[PDB]
Amino acid sequence: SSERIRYAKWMLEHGFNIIPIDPESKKPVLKEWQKYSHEMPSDEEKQRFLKMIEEGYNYAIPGGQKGMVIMDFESKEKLKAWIGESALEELCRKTLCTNTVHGGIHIYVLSNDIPPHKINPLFEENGKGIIDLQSYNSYVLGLGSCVNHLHCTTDKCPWKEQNYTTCYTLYNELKEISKVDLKSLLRFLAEKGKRLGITLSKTAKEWLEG
Ligand SMILES: [Mn+2]
Numbered sequence: 657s658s659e660r661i662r663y664a665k666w667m668l669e670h671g672f673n674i675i676p677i678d679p680e681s682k683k684p685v686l687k688e689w690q691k692y693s694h695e696m697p698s699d700e701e702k703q704r705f706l707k708m709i710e711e712g713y714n715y716a717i718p719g720g721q722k723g724m725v726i727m728d729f730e731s732k733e734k735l736k737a738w739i740g741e742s743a744l745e746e747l748c749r750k751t752l753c754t755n756t757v758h759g760g761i762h763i764y765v766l767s768n769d770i771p772p773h774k775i776n777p778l779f780e781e782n783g784k785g786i787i788d789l790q791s792y793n794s795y796v797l798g799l800g801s802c803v804n805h806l807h808c809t810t811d812k813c814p815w816k817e818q819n820y821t822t823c824y825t826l827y828n829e830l831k832e833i834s835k836v837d838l839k840s841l842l843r844f845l846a847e848k849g850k851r852l853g854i855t856l857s858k859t860a861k862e863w864l865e866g
């Protein structure tokens with residue numbers, strides 16, 4: 657059928673919880689969706705959630721689940737120039753990467769080490785963050801979800817007020833979310849970025865440096 661339901665079913669298939677997004681509020685159908693970073697949904701909530709998504713609701717994936725966290729980069733092209741095409745391909749070869757509706761890229765990973773606390777932005781370029789880590793108490797829109805930008809009027813908006821719809825798509829190939837040595841990955845981003853003026857944030861270094 658649609659890619660939206662295929663991928664929603666795919667995340668479930670792999671033991672990850674998803675939550676439908678209300679088309680109007682643009683927020684999860686349930687106020688306390690955070691509980692899904694730690695438990696499933698009953699078989700009479702899952703069914704309900706899948707019908708809504710089939711009907712056309714977008715859906716989100718709570719972070720933190722089974723050590724799963726999403727590295728949320730504001731710009732794919734920026735990341736390509738930062739760590740290089742080879743490194744980006746390598747990463748999106750071992751784990752799941754998706755294109756966001758605003759031109760960014762989500763790299764999903766499994767990490768024993770999850771910042772016990774919220775630490776963002778991880779990296780900054782011009783006193784402005786360029787990547788956030790989505791873990792417990794946050795979520796990302798999943799593959800197949802689409803957003804019409806007609807109602808976006810701020811600056812975080814590339815498609816400000818445009819009658820234009822984009823969707824979360826695969827960077828390249830579908831891959832199971834896999835393990836990565838997170839601190840090592842962040843060390844890598846740091847070494848690649850200092851020559852480009854891309855640096856670790858304050859809290860970020862603190863955590864990293866232990
Ligand atoms: Mn984001």
Ligand SMILES: [Zn+2]
Pocket residue numbers: 758803804805808813814815816
């Ligand atoms: Zn938009």
Ligand SMILES: [Zn+2]
Pocket residue numbers: 670832
């Ligand atoms: Zn599989």
